[PDB]
Amino acid sequence: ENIPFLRASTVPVIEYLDELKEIDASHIYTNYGPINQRFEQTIMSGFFQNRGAVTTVANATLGLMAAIQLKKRKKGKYALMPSFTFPATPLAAIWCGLEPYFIDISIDDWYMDKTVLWDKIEELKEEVAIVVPYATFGSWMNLEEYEELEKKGVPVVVDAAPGFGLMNGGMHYGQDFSGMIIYSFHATKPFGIGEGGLIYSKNEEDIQRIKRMGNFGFDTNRECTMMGFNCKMSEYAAAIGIATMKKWDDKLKERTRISEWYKQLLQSNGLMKKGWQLQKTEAVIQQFMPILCPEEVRNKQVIEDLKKQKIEARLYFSPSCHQQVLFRNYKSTDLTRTNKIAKRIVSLPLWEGMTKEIVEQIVICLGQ
Amino acid sequence: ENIPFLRASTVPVIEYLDELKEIDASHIYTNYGPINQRFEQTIMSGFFQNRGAVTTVANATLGLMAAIQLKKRKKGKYALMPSFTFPATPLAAIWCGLEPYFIDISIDDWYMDKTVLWDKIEELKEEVAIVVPYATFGSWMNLEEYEELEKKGVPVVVDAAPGFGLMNGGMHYGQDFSGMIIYSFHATKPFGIGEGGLIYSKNEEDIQRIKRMGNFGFDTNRECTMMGFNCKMSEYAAAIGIATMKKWDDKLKERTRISEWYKQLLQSNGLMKKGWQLQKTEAVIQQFMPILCPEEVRNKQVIEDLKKQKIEARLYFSPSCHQQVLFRNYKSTDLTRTNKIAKRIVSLPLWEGMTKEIVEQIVICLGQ
Ligand SMILES: [Ca+2]
Ligand SMILES: [Ca+2]
Ligand SMILES: [Ca+2]
């Protein structure tokens, strides 16, 4: 009767029932149990070419916390990151005792602007604790400059929360990265299991450390010898994870289809000619359809107009982090571009089961 | 063949499959979904006489973190707690930016000694940020004096991680407490579902706030207005929790029976006469069987002796927190009793399915 923003569809119980019965037989239910290891092994084989290492975590927000806590420089104070990201990103930083320092984004790709970033690193020197870029909207943010940062001794944790399963040229996003990449398996993201996350790194020793950190910093004596907490993923989450890997081809194909319908219908209804624009990026996997509305149109009015037509759009990210109550006083560079994107950005609905006619009803409402 | 220390048995899949069908039909998988709400309502009615409020969390460690972060006095530096606790407790404080300050325990009930705690509150004054007692080994640590601290403006968050389901005179442990109580649903704890936890308070508004904190500090506009992170429990975890509520009488009966057998066999084999002693408490629900070995016996000799008889005991908590690498340099009162109890404490196996003949094996081995 209406078009909601979110309609999650995780794999149904029949797809992971075998695994539930293995769990019941084994009487191991969490703490890096066999199903969790099998899930990690499957991911390393199917996505990461058996190079590097992964660990599951209970959610991507805990993964950011763990990665930042492990990798931050001891004497640093700031986590250099975009304001144009989900609040989880600066929150993970603050829980690690760091202050966010917001960096402006490019107007076209919506990633942190590397020119500004480099300049800020040069200026802050030892005050830089860590650099936390966001691979905006599950897209192909090239990591070449970030890999260079790691090699110069500036640690990098990439927030790719919504980008798991993003492939380009047959390579999975993040492959062989020196730093850490965090992905989310939240039910609302494309690889959605309910609650869950993953960390990848080419650095196997670092992944081994995060595994400890996720288990109270325990050594092999179950003695706490390093910072830690609990971010263990249960066997039950790993079970849905594994079943999701096996239906993933279908899901990726669904999203890709709906994405192409959006691009076609937008173009065919001449919305691009009216000044709507898509993100500039090589490759993306879409949680929703992000688009800039025309310069002369206020994005909150789009939301309101669509809401009259029974369609729920949203405004990721407006307010951006620097404009939100909690983060409004943290330092930043000039953020003119962020501010502009935050006035224009719209988030259009996209979920499994969406038909071409639904996309068309949305695209036509945009235009009228 | 070998008697292992832990042998978790969560309710089997058939017991929550209906709920899994509900989840699949609803397409709501997390973020305080209807099954999670049902679970919490079932707890409020079933355990807390519909007075106060609860929230699920992804695990008790994160619940501790949320609770301390909300309730800590903003000018304070220290979290006053026992050393004789699981490392999750001081780790939770350290993540909130506090230093643990360790307080000695009573030699008999093994709780934080209130006399020593009071003197220390009086000495530290504004430097006290929070008090975090542990209801050692799932027992009935009376909360009258802690309620008193709350009334005086000293915040208390009680770590009762292993004590969910603990009843005494028909009242659930923590009922009507003004502060917060954290409980765990880890698979190894008596009310075990995999990964999970719960927070109870008589203070409903505080619980509402914790809810927001565990969803990124979001208000109804999904804007971040307070410190927060992700500690949301999935619908799937709630599904198992609900099923665990229906079988809880069975689980509790099984554990009480095994405890009773332990007590009878220990007395009948003369072990009490030989200097072995149990916790002085009115009521306990048991994850394992804690016992002090005789003064002249080293508890770790008891471990190595049971070990070569195919029985895995452990030593919770030896080393105590103050003795573990990460926490050695935090301040404390004199800890003479904690040290003594950490030289004598032994953790004997107890799990669902343990037979009377298995307890007898064990108790007989203690007797030599
Ligand atoms: Ca199968
Ligand atoms: Ca049923
Ligand atoms: Ca039924």
| Residues of A with catalytic function | 189
Please provide residue B39's backbone torsions phi and psi, each rounded to the nearest 5 degrees: -60, -45
Closest residue by Cα to residue A236 from B161, B67, B23, B86: B23
Centre of ligand 1 from the C-alpha of residue A24, in Å: 15
Closest residue by Cα to residue A120 from A97, A103, A99, A140: A103
Of the partner residues A216, A232, A319, the one whose CB lies closest to the CB of residue B195: A232
Q: Write the CA distances from A193 to A34, A239, A241, integer angstroms.
A: 18, 9, 6
Residues with CB under 5 A from ligand 1 (ion): A 18
Tokens of A359: 């996309």
Which candidate in A218, A229, A233, A314 is best for mutational testing of the B interface (most B CBs within 10 A)? A229
Tokens of B48: 């807390």
A218 vs B contacts (CB less than 8 Å):
87
CA distance A142 to chain B (A): 28
Of the partner residues A8, A94, A237, the one whose CB lies closest to the CB of residue B27: A8
Q: Answer for the pair A332, A321: CB distance below 8 angstroms, yes or no.
A: no
Of the partner residues A10, A27, A319, the one whose CB lies closest to the CB of residue B223: A319
Dmax (CA) of chain B: 66
* Secondary structure, 3-state, B227-243: CCCECCCCHHHHHHHHH
What is the span of the domain harbouring residue A6? 1-368
Alpha-carbon distance B210 to B214, whole Å? 6
Radius of gyration of chain A measured on its C-alpha atoms: 21
Q: Can you list the pairs that B140-148 forms with residues at least 24 positions away whose Cβ atoms lie under 8 Å? A: B140/B166, B140/B168, B140/B173, B140/B281, B140/B282, B140/B283, B140/B284, B141/B109, B141/B111, B141/B281, B143/B174, B143/B177, B145/B114, B146/B177, B146/B179, B147/B177, B147/B178, B147/B179
Please provide residue B252's backbone torsions phi and psi, each rounded to the nearest 5 degrees: -65, -45
Q: Write the CA distances from A76 to A65, A91, B141, B149, integer angstroms.
A: 16, 17, 42, 38
Q: Answer for the pair A242, A40: CB distance below 8 angstroms, yes or no.
A: no
Contacts of B80 (CB under 8 A, 6+ apart): B101, B103, B112, B117, B120, B121, B124, B128, B130, B131, B132
Please provide residue B348's backbone torsions phi and psi, each rounded to the nearest 5 degrees: -100, 145
Among positive and negative, which fits the CA dihedral A219, A221, A227, A231?
positive
Q: Answer for the pair B10, A29: CB distance below 8 angstroms, yes or no.
A: yes
CATH number at residue B214: 3.40.640.10
Which candidate in A234, A317, A321 is best for mutational testing of the B interface (most B CBs within 10 A)? A234
Q: Answer for the pair B134, B114: CB distance below 8 angstroms, yes or no.
A: no
Centre of ligand 1 from the C-alpha of residue B240, in Å: 21
A237 vs B contacts (CB less than 8 Å):
234, 236
Residues with CB under 5 A from ligand 2 (ion): B 18
Contact A229 B88 (CB under 8 A): yes
- Name the active-site residue from B120, B189, B202, B211: B189
Q: Are strands B99-103 and A167-168 parallel, antiparallel or unpaired?
A: unpaired
Contact B217 A87 (CB under 8 A): yes
Q: Answer for the pair A173, A166: CB distance below 8 angstroms, yes or no.
A: yes
Contact B324 A223 (CB under 8 A): yes
Residue ranges for the known binding site of A for Ca(2+) are: 18
Tokens of A16: 């992971």
Q: Which experiment gave this structure?
A: X-ray
Q: How far is CA A263 from the centre of its chain?
A: 22
Q: Answer for the pair A117, A105: CB distance below 8 angstroms, yes or no.
A: no
Which candidate in A27, A233, A314 is best for mutational testing of the B interface (most B CBs within 10 A)? A27
Of the partner residues B65, B187, B325, the one whose CB lies closest to the CB of residue A29: B187
B213 vs A contacts (CB less than 8 Å):
none
Closest residue by Cα to residue B228 from B92, B97, B67: B67
Alpha-carbon distance B142 to B304, whole Å? 35
SS3 A221: coil
Centre of ligand 1 from the C-alpha of residue A241, in Å: 13
Q: Write the CA distances from A278 to A84, A86, A163, integer angstroms.
A: 16, 19, 17
Contact A91 B216 (CB under 8 A): yes
Alpha-carbon distance A342 to A319, whole Å? 7
Of the partner residues B62, B187, B327, the one whose CB lies closest to the CB of residue A230: B62
Tokens of B209: 């706030």
Among positive and negative, which fits the CA dihedral A39, A45, A50, A52?
negative
Q: How far is CA A150 from the centre of its chain?
A: 20
B232 vs A contacts (CB less than 8 Å):
59, 195
Closest residue by Cα to residue B124 from B98, B147, B145, B142: B98
Q: Answer for the pair A81, A89: CB distance below 8 angstroms, yes or no.
A: yes
Residue of B nearest to A238 (CA): B194
Alpha-carbon distance A367 to A61, whole Å? 37
Q: Interior CA angle at A133 toward A130 and A139, to 5°?
A: 155
Tokens of A56: 């599951």
Alpha-carbon distance A2 to A308, whole Å? 10
B251 is catalytic: no
Contact A234 B87 (CB under 8 A): no
* Secondary structure, 3-state, chain B: CCECCCCCCCCCHHHHHHHHHHHHHHCCCCCCCHHHHHHHHHHHHHCCCCCCEEEEECCHHHHHHHHHHHHCCCCCCEEEEECCCCCHHHHHHHHCCCEEEEECECCCCCCECHHHHHHHHHHHHHHEEEECCECCCCECCCCHHHHHHHHCCCCEEEECCCCCCCEECCEECCCCCCCEEEEECECCCCCCCECCEEEEECCHHHHHHHHHHCECCECCCCCECCCCCECCCCHHHHHHHHHHHHCHHHHHHHHHHHHHHHHHHHHHCCCCCCCCECCCCCCECCCCEEEECCCCCCHHHHHHHHHCCCECCECCCCCCHHHCHHHCCCCECCCHHHHHHHHHEEEECCCCCCCHHHHHHHHHHHCC
Which candidate in B27, B28, B159, B230 is best for mutational testing of the A interface (most A CBs within 10 A)? B230
Tokens of B326: 């990460």
B27 vs A contacts (CB less than 8 Å):
7-9
Q: Write the CA distances from B219 to A86, A137, B209, B215, B235, integer angstroms.
A: 15, 23, 10, 9, 21
Tokens of B133: 């007692």
Q: How many domains, in total, are found in chain A? A: 1
Alpha-carbon distance A199 to A211, whole Å? 10
Place of tokens 């110069």: A152
> How many A/B residue pairs have CB atoms within 8 Å?
155
CA distance B177 to chain A (A): 26
Centre of ligand 1 from the C-alpha of residue A165, in Å: 22
Ligand at shortest distance from the CA of B16: 2
Alpha-carbon distance B44 to B22, whole Å? 22
Tokens of A104: 């402006």
Radius of gyration of chain B measured on its C-alpha atoms: 21
CA distance B314 to chain A (A): 11
